Symmetry: C3
Subunit: 281 residues, 3 copies
């Protein structure tokens, strides 16, 4: 199924019939960082299997729902169950849910992820507001937009220079200052490692040379589809480790350690994003 | 359809029956840089749809013809309507028209493109004679030659060290000096960004660190297929912008600005390439 | 055919019925470096075409056998006929033979390849013990593990920091010292160029900037599948040329020169790996 105007329209029509919510904010949450979705008020849960043209996710299993409702007096739509390109999903499968958000009325997309620290001053448990990216799949002919252009959504050759909205970064930082955790908050450039292997020690050293602050396996495909169709983005990385220190010390990293960091910062991140939603212009 | 000897031979036989031109020069022109094709003398226009085994291009639409005839007393074949890998065409579809050129007798391929400037001394409207490349898709397992080797055309493991003919570069520069525009002409290394998004500001900064002079979304696949089968290449970039200055100044870029630069330099480039054709050894 | 537990089990059951050898060591040898396979004692040769679910290799042709038997009193299994990703094989086809080795009992995998020198002190004919890698296909969404995870073999997100066993490197070097050729033996970081074109001169210069010691078109996919399922690896490159000196001098490289270097070092490499096998803990 192609992520075209007709197929996205059929999905949007179904969602509008069953939900009665017109959202202007979309959210996609990282692993272990989804508790905010469980606090959506007056909510409607829509299994992906029920939505015309949504991708099939039963090989990976686990949860897969769209959730619509209210947070802080604002109307939102959340993806509960994220699609990642290292799982083998196609460009068209990743893009269709974001283009459906666009047709439902979404103007702002908020994204979180887990990442490895490259910049030497980043510690486990820090947050990084993403200000730009280095897209190794895109340079290498695996960009999410390779294929025919869907002209109803955006241009053949998009400019990504404003993909990460400056004013949304400024608001996120202001709220951190108001709540006395600004010492945890940095800004930086995100390297997209297609995955699913963690960056090797020598790849980490290369990313340091090339101007990268953090590295991870998600987010950039969604950012590009959003920018192509005019949706503003705020993207925040939670740092699980410093990959450069681990390379210099011959120390390992695993999904388990990553998940313990997520649990340590989950409640803080949930409160931060609830306040960002409440305060968005 | 595979770009093999039998399928290329069937295409070449059809073209020879309808055209009566045996070309020794091939041309592929960049966006907005095709006016020379309209001045081919005693010409024959062959729609791609008529040629056995040529790729289907009706999803992207627009023009698609092979044009054969005379320029400056030389016999040539031009692609009118270019295939790009960011559109989703396969390795085999890009390669077949170049291998058909080889079987028709082509010994020299001339290519133009639009590109972004990385080297700080490159201005909008400058020309860059390409002397080498950095092939991010090739490093990343998306090389145009991934697949079985077609042994009738070339070796399993080609050497690209002489892909950009030195004597053709020297002739292009000499003609620029004769016509008093050598101050517009530079040489440099071309980075292949698979596309279709323009290079991000942070990707531009990375390419500066890595020794790149210009960046674009075409040309390298065609160069590799030509080199594999023994066709000499001259490739020239028209600079639409300096991506490094735009990154430092927080300034944007779009297809519209690119096309205005093409219109400014179209007539000069047309006269330059007509004289190169006339003068080729 | 997917490289899953059921399909690998059916292959392993067939091999066990016909061979009566339970191997604990696997070997994969580079081009021209396979003479050790012909000296396996009490051996059983199993054509790939006979093994359930093994990949089809008749488009590339040449040899394709699994060979089981004894070397230095140890039980081994060798791939005679290597699968390379530049030939167009899928992730699943490369991975299945290594996962079959795992189910047969293999605990250690020994690999050789031919490579180009980037580090300026590497000469044609030198050996490089690989201590780490830079995986351009992996960064660019062409990692060998892209797809569903096969949980019976390993984790969704593997750590590669110990992919190249330190103690096996130390043993290889000790044997070189015992036999007075340690002056040929170096250590270094391997860049994976997907191929099949040799690295261009400007790509070689980039790899120098990024901390690479050698570059080649194989090995990293097999290393990653082995590490994912807990098999220890020793990987050794034979240097065919110094790509940086050749770039600075405008000198060429070809498969023929590479193969003459292989013939010069074949007997030494064969004796080295026979002694490594004999001595493995
Ligand atoms: N002050 C409330 C809003 C907010 C934002 C971030 C962290 C904690 C809290 C509590
Ligand atoms: N002198 C003619 C040949 C040529 C080459 C380049 C630009 C203008 C002209 C006119
Ligand atoms: N000493 C034997 C074992 C070995 C290892 C490496 C090279 C030659 C030989 C001969």
């Amino acid at each position: 199924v192609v992520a075209n105007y007709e197929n996205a329209s059929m999905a949007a029509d179904y969602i509008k019939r069953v939900s009665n919510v017109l959202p202007d904010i979309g959210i996609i949450c990282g692993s272990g960082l989804g508790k905010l979705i469980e606090e959506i008020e007056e909510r409607k849960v829509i299994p992906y299997i029920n939505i015309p043209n949504f991708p099939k996710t039963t090989v990976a299993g686990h949860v897969g729902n769209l959730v619509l409702g209210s947070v802080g007096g604002r109307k939102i739509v959340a993806m509960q169950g994220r699609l990642h390109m290292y799982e083998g999903y196609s460009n068209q499968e990743i893009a269709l849910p974001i283009r459906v958000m666009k047709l439902l009325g979404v103007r702002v997309l908020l994204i979180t992820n887990l990442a490895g620290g490259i910049n030497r001053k980043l510690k486990s448990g820090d947050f990084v507001l993403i200000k730009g990216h280095i897209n190794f799949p895109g340079l290498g002919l695996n960009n999410v937009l390779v294929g025919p252009n869907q002209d109803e959504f955006g241009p053949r050759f998009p400019d990504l220079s404003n993909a990460y909205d400056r004013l949304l970064q400024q608001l996120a930082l202001k709220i951190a200052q108001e709540n006395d955790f600004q010492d945890l908050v940095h800004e930086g450039v995100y390297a997209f490692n297609g995955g699913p292997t963690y960056e090797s020690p020598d790849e980490s050293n290369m990313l340091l040379k090339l101007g990268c602050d953090v590295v991870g396996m998600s987010t950039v495909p969604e950012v590009i589809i959003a920018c192509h169709c005019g949706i503003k983005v705020l993207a925040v990385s939670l740092i699980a480790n410093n990959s450069i220190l681990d390379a210099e010390n011959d120390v390992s990293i695993n999904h388990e350690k990553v998940l313990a960091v997520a649990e340590k910062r989950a409640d803080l991140l949930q409160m931060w994003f609830k306040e960002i939603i409440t305060r968005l212009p």
